[PDB]
Amino acid sequence: GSSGSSGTCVFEKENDPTVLRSPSAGKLTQYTVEDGGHVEAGSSYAEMEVMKMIMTLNVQERGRVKYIKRPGAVLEAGCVVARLELDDPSKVHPSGPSSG
């Protein structure tokens, strides 16, 4: 049992902390959150189909998931799917460090 496959191994330094690229090829289907939907770091915001398998897509860092690419596109390794919008990029609360 072995069909066969091959590809190139190229590296590219370009991945913003507010971007949700595809870790592996597949096929975009739909999302599990509404426009600019807010979720937790780890929650699923969308899914995909790869190797005849449906895999869930989680956010690398809590924020707001938004659909950019139309639903039903070709998911490829190291590609763009949706961007994340940090809802808490900075917010110094009125309280410093205290004995522990």
Tab-separated table of C-alpha atoms in Angstrom:
chain	number	residue	atom	x	y	z
A	1	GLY	CA	0.000	0.000	0.000
A	2	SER	CA	1.713	3.114	-1.304
A	3	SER	CA	0.404	5.427	-3.998
A	4	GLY	CA	3.290	7.874	-4.001
A	5	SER	CA	3.861	11.587	-3.536
A	6	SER	CA	6.537	14.265	-3.545
A	7	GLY	CA	7.097	17.995	-3.251
A	8	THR	CA	9.566	20.776	-2.542
A	9	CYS	CA	10.866	21.971	0.806
A	10	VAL	CA	11.111	25.747	0.685
A	11	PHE	CA	11.141	28.056	3.682
A	12	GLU	CA	9.599	31.508	3.869
A	13	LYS	CA	9.735	33.916	6.786
A	14	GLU	CA	6.393	35.685	6.625
A	15	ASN	CA	3.661	34.990	9.150
A	16	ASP	CA	2.057	37.790	11.129
A	17	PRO	CA	0.778	37.079	14.647
A	18	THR	CA	-2.617	38.226	13.426
A	19	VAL	CA	-2.906	35.738	10.588
A	20	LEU	CA	-4.260	32.208	10.421
A	21	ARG	CA	-2.381	30.371	7.696
A	22	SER	CA	-3.008	26.783	6.668
A	23	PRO	CA	-0.714	24.354	8.497
A	24	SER	CA	-1.595	21.719	5.926
A	25	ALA	CA	-3.355	21.434	2.588
A	26	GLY	CA	-7.018	20.494	2.435
A	27	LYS	CA	-10.232	22.146	1.311
A	28	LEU	CA	-12.022	24.986	3.060
A	29	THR	CA	-15.613	24.105	3.866
A	30	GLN	CA	-17.138	26.525	6.345
A	31	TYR	CA	-16.683	28.274	9.671
A	32	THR	CA	-17.927	27.630	13.186
A	33	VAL	CA	-18.092	31.285	14.156
A	34	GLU	CA	-19.867	34.346	12.812
A	35	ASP	CA	-18.234	37.406	11.295
A	36	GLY	CA	-15.386	38.644	13.458
A	37	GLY	CA	-16.406	35.877	15.830
A	38	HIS	CA	-14.538	35.888	19.122
A	39	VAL	CA	-13.173	32.651	20.528
A	40	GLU	CA	-10.553	31.335	22.923
A	41	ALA	CA	-6.980	30.341	22.170
A	42	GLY	CA	-7.542	26.739	21.153
A	43	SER	CA	-11.195	26.884	20.170
A	44	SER	CA	-12.251	25.974	16.651
A	45	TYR	CA	-13.174	28.777	14.282
A	46	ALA	CA	-13.261	26.788	11.063
A	47	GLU	CA	-12.577	23.398	9.526
A	48	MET	CA	-11.059	21.780	6.460
A	49	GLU	CA	-10.816	18.571	4.467
A	50	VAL	CA	-7.456	16.951	3.822
A	51	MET	CA	-6.477	13.435	2.818
A	52	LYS	CA	-10.178	12.654	2.670
A	53	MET	CA	-10.290	13.689	6.310
A	54	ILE	CA	-12.062	16.559	8.025
A	55	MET	CA	-9.808	18.446	10.409
A	56	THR	CA	-10.791	21.211	12.801
A	57	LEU	CA	-9.094	24.593	12.707
A	58	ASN	CA	-8.257	26.301	15.981
A	59	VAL	CA	-6.834	29.741	16.658
A	60	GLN	CA	-3.206	30.056	17.687
A	61	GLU	CA	-4.167	32.959	19.920
A	62	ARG	CA	-7.552	34.093	21.177
A	63	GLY	CA	-9.106	36.922	19.203
A	64	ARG	CA	-11.669	37.398	16.458
A	65	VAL	CA	-11.895	35.056	13.493
A	66	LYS	CA	-13.067	36.444	10.172
A	67	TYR	CA	-13.602	34.828	6.791
A	68	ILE	CA	-11.552	36.334	3.989
A	69	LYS	CA	-11.330	33.564	1.418
A	70	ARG	CA	-14.600	32.420	-0.106
A	71	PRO	CA	-16.007	29.142	1.232
A	72	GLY	CA	-15.052	26.279	-1.051
A	73	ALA	CA	-11.500	27.256	-1.918
A	74	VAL	CA	-8.467	25.022	-2.276
A	75	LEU	CA	-6.630	24.719	1.019
A	76	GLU	CA	-2.888	24.403	0.549
A	77	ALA	CA	0.100	24.164	2.861
A	78	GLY	CA	1.318	27.562	4.002
A	79	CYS	CA	-1.634	29.499	2.637
A	80	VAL	CA	-3.991	32.201	3.849
A	81	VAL	CA	-7.444	31.416	5.182
A	82	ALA	CA	-8.487	34.023	7.721
A	83	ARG	CA	-6.969	36.743	9.872
A	84	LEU	CA	-7.139	37.171	13.628
A	85	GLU	CA	-7.895	40.419	15.417
A	86	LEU	CA	-6.454	40.703	18.905
A	87	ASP	CA	-9.187	42.029	21.164
A	88	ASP	CA	-6.665	42.538	23.941
A	89	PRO	CA	-3.435	43.790	22.353
A	90	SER	CA	-2.766	45.883	25.434
A	91	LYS	CA	-4.653	47.080	28.490
A	92	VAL	CA	-2.615	47.958	31.556
A	93	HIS	CA	-4.947	47.557	34.511
A	94	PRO	CA	-4.801	49.910	37.504
A	95	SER	CA	-2.822	47.573	39.731
A	96	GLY	CA	0.857	46.752	40.059
A	97	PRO	CA	2.683	43.745	41.522
A	98	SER	CA	2.022	42.629	45.078
A	99	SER	CA	3.659	40.258	47.531
A	100	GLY	CA	2.987	36.603	46.812
